[PDB]
């Protein structure tokens, strides 16, 4: 039984617990390739099912994901409950190292679900996005307003009947929105924004002079203290999931590159692993090693960017220049291998686009000799500076409970002391064959603690690169599956069967058989996951992308309340987010 085999997960103890608590007819178990138990729950039992999972002996403490799906055009729904729409809730039990998806069916006219914000406070933005993109009402939600589109938007873009392409540009709408932005400060009402109540009101954005994007924060201030703050996001919404419904399985890889643009192949990895789950492809070991190589190189690139950005936000200006020289070394190696700098689009369904070019090990050895002295110099020049420590330590701290209840993953969760890395807990792409440690914090997630954890993660990625350089397998760079897209180029250029497979795979698209798959990886900023629904066609029926920056930005008001604005700037600099990852 391979890892991609369709499982029902009836042997999971959570299924037995749900059967013993709610009865055998209260829910329907769906067999998928997602690797998790998928359980269709009735809508009226959703809150008690969530409470029961929250009160388990080893409970499901984190709401990993919450989003909708338009199932009106889905043809292969055999064994599934009748649903015009559905809402899925992905919950993670860290103690069990398990996860469960709960799906609620909804009719076309009765598009309302009970809110999940009481059980999980991070459900607020997910329900706002599900209402925004699907029109699904959440009863009991405090402020069910649009979060990606502007408030004066008609329709719900992720529905199947919504036209995906760009509308014709009009100067009238631009002028009207400019007038709206001009009179926004004059007619600001702090009731539609979810706020309440010498209380100054300020706008931080929308333009921001930094490298993580441009987004607006509405601040309520008592002098310097922050009483309340809500973020205005969706300014960088590219419609990547809707493009998932519009590209083929192969031609969507460059779009997966630009989800978070500091990651590249790290962003390509969960998508291609989920497509390989849909295709039934077990990639060879050299493919796993190459993909791990590129993921760790881009992880070092992203962490160097993050440390430099944090140091520059504190006020030291030189280490960003030095670490951009280090990024240039990494980019030299990545340019040699993939042909591009930051959006390589080099991962393929079944492997990688090309073999490693002859001479890559020299560039890897040069970078591995270059990096550690520079990292020690960065530490001793800026990270051990007492002014930086005073600006960083004790700023926007939270414990493990706040990280769990808000879906915070990555360096913040491990800085709260929770040892939960995807590469160790739920290994993927042959990460079990590499010896590396997972740095953890003492139990409190400061800005400084997160930054030093990212430094230790950079050192561990350097160790992974060392082991990969000393032990490189020889073999194929693509799998020998009929659904390896595209096939190897030389066989395409001189064999007619391979030419036929290449012809149909690049033009109409590879045919993924009707199934659902899911891949979760430890990205550069947290846990990045792809949830893929195939309706048997050459395009994705649904492409749900869970990104960690969304969860961190939703955690922002619960951790910075009662602090200053400079502390807010430092907290923004130490979160490791990009706005493309937030909005996607």
């Amino acid at each position: 039984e391979p890892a991609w085999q369709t499982r029902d997960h009836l042997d999971d103890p959570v299924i037995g617990e749900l059967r013993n608590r709610f009865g055998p007819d209260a829910f329907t178990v769906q067999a998928t390739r997602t690797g998790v138990p998928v359980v269709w729950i009735k809508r009226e039992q959703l809150l008690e099912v969530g409470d029961f999972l929250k009160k388990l002996p080893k409970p499901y403490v984190m709401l990993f994901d919450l989003h909708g799906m338009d199932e009106r055009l889905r043809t292969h729904r055999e064994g599934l409950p009748a649903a015009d729409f559905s809402v899925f809730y992905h919950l993670i039990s860290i103690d069990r190292n398990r996860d469960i998806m709960l799906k609620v069916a909804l009719a076309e006219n009765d598009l309302h679900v009970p809110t999940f914000t009481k059980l999980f406070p991070n459900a607020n933005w997910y329900e706002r996005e599900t209402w925004d993109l699907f029109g699904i009402t959440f009863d009991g939600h405090p402020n069910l307003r649009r979060i990606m589109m502007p408030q004066t938007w008609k329709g719900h873009p992720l529905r199947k009947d919504y036209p995906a392409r760009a509308t014709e540009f009009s100067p009238f709408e631009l002028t009207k929105a400019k007038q709206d932005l001009e009179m926004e400060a004059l007619t600001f009402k702090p009731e539609e924004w979810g706020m309440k109540r010498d209380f100054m009101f300020l706008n931080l954005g929308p333009n921001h002079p930094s490298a993580h994007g441009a987004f607006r924060i509405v601040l309520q201030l008592d002098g310097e203290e922050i009483v309340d703050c809500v973020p205005d996001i969706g300014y960088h919404h590219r419609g990547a999931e809707k493009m998932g419904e519009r590209q083929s399985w192969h031609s969507y890889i460059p779009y997966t590159d630009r989800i978070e643009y500091l990651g590249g192949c790290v962003n390509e990895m969960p998508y291609v692993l989920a497509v390989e789950k849909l295709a039934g492809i077990t990639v060879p070991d050299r493919v796993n090693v190459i993909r791990v190589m590129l993921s760790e190189l881009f992880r070092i690139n992203s962490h160097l960017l993050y440390i430099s950005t944090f140091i520059q936000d504190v006020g030291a200006m030189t280490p960003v220049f030095f670490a951009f020289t280090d990024r240039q070394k990494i980019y030299d190696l990545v340019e040699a291998i993939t042909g591009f700098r930051m959006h390589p689009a080099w991962f393929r369904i079944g492997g990688v686009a090309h073999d490693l070019p002859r001479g890559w090990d020299r560039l890897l050895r040069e970078f591995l000799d270059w990096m550690p002295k520079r990292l020690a110099s960065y530490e001793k020049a800026a990270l051990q500076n007492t002014i930086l420590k005073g600006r960083s330590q004790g700023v926007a701290a939270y414990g493990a409970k706040e990280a769990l209840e808000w879906g915070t993953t990555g360096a913040g969760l491990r800085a709260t002391g929770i040892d939960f890395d995807v590469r160790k807990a739920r290994p993927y792409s042959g990460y079990e064959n590499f010896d590396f440690e997972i740095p953890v914090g003492g139990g409190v997630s400061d800005c400084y603690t997160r930054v030093m954890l990212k430094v230790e993660e950079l050192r561990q990625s350097l160790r992974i690169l060392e082991q990969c350089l000393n032990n490189m397998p020889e073999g194929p760079f693509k799998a020998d599956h009929p659904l390896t897209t595209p096939p190897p180029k030389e066989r395409t250029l001189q064999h007619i069967e391979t030419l036929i497979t290449h012809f149909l795979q690049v033009s109409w698209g590879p045919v993924m058989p009707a199934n659902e798959s899911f891949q979760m990886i430890e990205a550069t900023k947290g846990i990045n996951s792809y949830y893929l629904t195939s309706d048997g066609s050459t395009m994705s029926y649904r492409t749900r992308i869970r990104t960690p920056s969304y969860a961190h930005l939703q955690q922002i008001p619960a951790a910075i309340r009662g602090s200053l604005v400079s502390d807010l700037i430092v907290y923004l600099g130490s979160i490791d987010f990009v706005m493309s990852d937030v909005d996607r």
């Binding site: 055009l73 043809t75 392409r165 009929p482 007619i496 391979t498 012809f503 033009s507 109409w508």
Partner: protein, 905 residues
């Protein structure tokens, strides 16, 4: 019957074989040599499944599912490892000799062999030896031949010979050097040779006309349209790219034209792409041609119409129901004239009266293949209604089908059916002025003038029923042949009588109605078919109006000073001299047309109408079925200065500007509702297609496939800024991929067939409820009239015998599939296929004039001395002269017309 496929129970029909039963259930079995219309022969060995004797069986046995009946309690497995490995091995064996040709092959992206190579999962080549090659033949102007790509599936020979009745295509050679083609280079003789491009699962037979301006299937913009080249109304999928019509694919209609077109419909689309078509409205001012936009053309036309004292409208059978109705509304009902001759209109009205008042059911084109005896009276169906000739061939082979069914042989085992039915066939009696293309299978062929064919029909009706009027002057051997026809028709369970208006004789239609009434009175399940001339001839006949001669006298007498001619060249329905004189006398001529005709030289205004590829509308076919054709592309998308609108849009806006001095570019559904309200006989055309508000779960129907390419570069040479997507307010389709083309969508209008893993024309199997049956959720199109309870009376007007009078010469019509239809003549690829115009003469008459075969003689009709070279026709009757109709100068109104001054040039 009950089958168990991979452990799952299924309820199927026991008369089908296993492959078609499993394809009807959505299961994917690869197959090459089987076709839903051709039967099973078990050649390619691709459809192999594993059959078990019972539920508790583990070994099983490989069987061909196309040759295995779907009997009750049949246990099989498709996903068995042995069956999968054998199907992969069959694909691999086919792949050993296949050329490395997919990038430079016209079947790429539309290839069944590509789809089944991918479907079997075979992508690694372990064959290292040489591949066999073949020379290619020249098959004419339509079909391109590439013998290297063949997989020896024998579909071409089975279709072309056993189905189409063609003789010149065959299989030659031996063991692995099997060749499929003609014995020598030359044009494929069959009128249905074009369906080889969809029958062949590989790139051997390709559309050469498409291969000129080739584009891949994912790059096409498709629409569900109706073929406009005769009255049968076959469902087509025109596909375009870069503003020009690229291809005509067959569109599956299980009630009309299921898998097959004829070559005139498939290849005679080249008139749409002509560079001399009107693309802007042009106004005449002295000798100047001023190009107008839509608004100022409408304003000037309506002003000049308002100053006129009486405006008449001349419709055409080429135009749609909506455009003819819009002209009728613009000029008034009493001023509307059908643009056909008085004799043509009389024959059309009589055919319509027989169809919707004779009390005899008129079959659809698919239903013709189930009749037990066929009598064709005066209609050269192979040249005028070719798909009816194909269905008549199927009905003729029905006797072999019945003989095989008497021996408990299944209907899909075609080889056994043809073996049992060696040469026994159902009775076919065709009458014409000469030999027809159905003579190879006809039980009898009667070569006679139209009066003698009508007298034969009246004699058959009298011998079947003595209440019918009798015929005096029948020869004894002709009486014996009449008796043979009578005992053949009386013994038939389902006799079928076919006639039409192309014979040029009212008495032929009257005699056919008399035969059908006589068979109806005996209790037989008789059907009657009438072949009209043009695409909307029945619609123009139902609409009614005056003849073209009445309009010409109205123009000549000065009672009408303004004439609006809609999609009519006026030369095919009247003499050119009289038409030119009447149009020169009229102070205002406004020609709304999409083809450069000869009457726009004297026209004051020319409105650049849209053809069928650029317009929506409704057409009524020869059996009275309303069918909606949809616009394929917007002509203003690539050339932004093109003002090319629907004809009904032009005329409705002209009426609105004439009334309220304001343009009104209306919607299609408004004109449809106006037709339904004003004309109750056309009330069925509302149900031909749903309106523009029709959605599939809230979204429109897509015109182009999902992988449509180059959307930010096709117009980048004009401007780098992407243009606005053309909005479609008339119909439920969209000019984009943003829509639905799912095979399980609740609709009947399907623009093109594509399912994932099925890029070939075999995706129509996915678009049907059962393969080879009807479209799922019904076939598009609605019959306008039901069968009447009471029929007509016997037509007592029995004509006399044909008397050859000296000086006079009766014109016998000789129709050609490539050359009798006007727009098909305009297609440049038909100019090579169409023959040189030969005037047909009897040997006795040619000896009387002393002219030999090939010499030129000159004859004068309506003061027009034209010369033609003589071809000797032995089957022609003396006193008649044969003329090719529709050709250069030979209008189709010469059928039954007398001739003077036949002399050698």
């Amino acid at each position: 019957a009950t089958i168990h496929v991979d452990g799952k129970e299924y309820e199927v029909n026991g008369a089908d074989n296993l492959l078609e039963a499993c394809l009807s259930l959505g299961l994917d079995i690869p197959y090459f040599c089987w076709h839903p219309a051709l039967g099973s022969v078990g050649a390619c060995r691709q459809c192999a499944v594993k059959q078990y004797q019972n539920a508790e069986d583990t070994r099983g046995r490989l069987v061909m599912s196309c040759m295995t009946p779907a009997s009750d309690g049949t246990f099989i497995s498709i996903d068995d490892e042995e069956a999968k490995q054998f199907r992969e091995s069959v694909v691999e064996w086919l792949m050993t000799n296949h050329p490395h040709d997919c990038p430079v092959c016209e079947e790429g992206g539309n290839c069944h062999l590509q789809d089944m190579t991918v479907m079997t999962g075979h992508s690694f080549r372990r064959y290292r030896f040489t591949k066999r090659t073949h020379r290619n033949q020249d098959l004419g102007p339509f079909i391109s031949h590439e013998m290297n790509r063949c997989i020896a599936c024998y579909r071409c020979v089975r279709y072309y010979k056993d189905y189409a009745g063609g003789t010149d295509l065959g299989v030659y050679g031996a063991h692995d050097n099997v060749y499929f083609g003609r014995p020598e280079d030359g044009t494929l003789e069959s009128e249905f040779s074009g369906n080889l491009v969809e029958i062949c699962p590989t790139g051997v037979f390709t559309d050469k006309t498409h291969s000129e301006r080739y584009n891949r299937k994912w790059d096409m913009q498709f629409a569900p349209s109706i073929c406009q080249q005769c009255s049968i109304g076959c469902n087509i999928s025109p596909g375009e790219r870069y503003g020009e019509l690229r291809r005509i694919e067959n569109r599956y209609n299980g009630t009309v034209n299921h898998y097959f077109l004829c070559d005139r419909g498939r290849f005679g689309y080249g008139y749409v792409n002509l560079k001399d078509r009107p693309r802007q409205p042009v106004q005449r001012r002295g000798d100047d041609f001023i190009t107008l936009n839509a608004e100022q053309a409408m304003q000037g036309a309506a002003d000049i119409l308002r100053q006129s004292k009486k405006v008449i409208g001349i419709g055409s059978p080429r135009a749609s129901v909506e455009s003819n109705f819009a002209l009728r509304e613009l000029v008034g009902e009493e001023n509307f004239y059908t643009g056909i001759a008085h004799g043509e209109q009389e024959r059309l009205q009589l055919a319509l009266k027989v169809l919707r008042e004779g009390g005899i059911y008129t079959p659809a084109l698919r239903e013709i293949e189930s009749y037990d005896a066929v009598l064709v009276l005066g209609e050269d169906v192979t040249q005028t209604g070719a798909r009816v000739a194909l269905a008549v061939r199927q009905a003729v082979k029905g006797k072999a089908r019945e003989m095989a069914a008497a021996q408990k042989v299944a209907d899909w085992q075609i080889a056994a059916i043809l073996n049992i039915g060696q040469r026994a066939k159902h009775p076919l009696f065709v009458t014409n002025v000469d030999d027809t293309r159905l003579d190879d299978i006809a039980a009898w062929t009667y070569r006679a003038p139209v009066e003698d064919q009508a007298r034969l029909g009246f004699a058959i009706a009298h011998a079947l029923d003595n209440s019918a009027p009798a015929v005096d002057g029948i020869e004894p051997e002709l009486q014996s042949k009449i008796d043979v026809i009578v005992q053949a028709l009386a013994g038939a369970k389902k006799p079928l009588i076919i006639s039409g208006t192309n014979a040029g004789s009212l008495e032929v239609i009257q005699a056919a109605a008399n035969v059908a009434k006589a068979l109806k009175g005996r209790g037989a399940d008789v059907g009657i078919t009438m072949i009209a001339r043009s695409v909307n001839s029945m619609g123009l006949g139902i609409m009614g109006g005056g003849s073209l001669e009445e309009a010409l006298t109205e123009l000549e007498t000065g009672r009408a000073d303004a004439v609006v001619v809609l999609e009519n060249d006026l030369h095919r329905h009247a003499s050119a001299t009289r038409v030119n004189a009447a149009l020169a006398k009229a102070p205002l001529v406004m020609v709304v047309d999409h083809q450069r005709t000869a009457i726009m030289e004297n026209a004051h205004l020319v409105l650049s109408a849209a053809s069928f590829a650029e317009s929506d509308g409704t057409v009524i076919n020869n059996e009275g079925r309303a069918q909606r054709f949809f616009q394929v592309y917007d002509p203003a998308y690539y050339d932004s200065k093109t003002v090319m609108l629907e004809s009904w849009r032009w005329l409705h806006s002209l009426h609105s500007t004439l009334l309220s001095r304001e343009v009104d570019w209306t919607q299609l559904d408004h004109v449809i509702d106006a037709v339904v309200a004003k004309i109750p006989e056309l009330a069925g055309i509302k149900d031909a297609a749903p309106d523009a508000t029709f959605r599939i779960r809230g979204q429109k129907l897509a015109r182009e496939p999902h992988r449509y390419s180059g959307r930010t570069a096709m117009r980048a040479n004009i401007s780098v800024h992407e243009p606005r997507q053309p909005q479609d307010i008339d119909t439920m389709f969209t000019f984009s991929m943003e829509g639905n083309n799912q095979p399980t969508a609740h609709r009947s209008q399907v623009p093109f067939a594509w399912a994932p893993g099925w890029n070939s024309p075999q995706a129509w199997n996915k678009f049907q409820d059962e393969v080879g049956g009807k479209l799922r959720f019904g076939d598009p199109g609605v019959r306008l009239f039901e069968t009447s309870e009471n029929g007509l009376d016997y037509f007592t007007s029995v004509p006399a015998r044909f008397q050859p009078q000296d000086g006079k010469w009766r014109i016998a019509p000789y129709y050609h599939l490539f050359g009798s239809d006007e727009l098909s003549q305009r297609a440049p690829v038909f100019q090579s296929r169409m023959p040189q115009p030969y005037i047909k003469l009897n040997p006795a008459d040619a000896a009387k004039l002393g002219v030999n075969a090939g010499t030129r003689v000159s004859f004068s009709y309506d003061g027009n001395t034209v010369t033609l070279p003589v071809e000797i026709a032995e089957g022609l009757t003396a006193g008649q002269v044969g003329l090719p109709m529709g050709m250069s100068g030979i209008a189709p109104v010469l059928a039954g017309a007398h001739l003077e001054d036949l002399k050698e040039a």
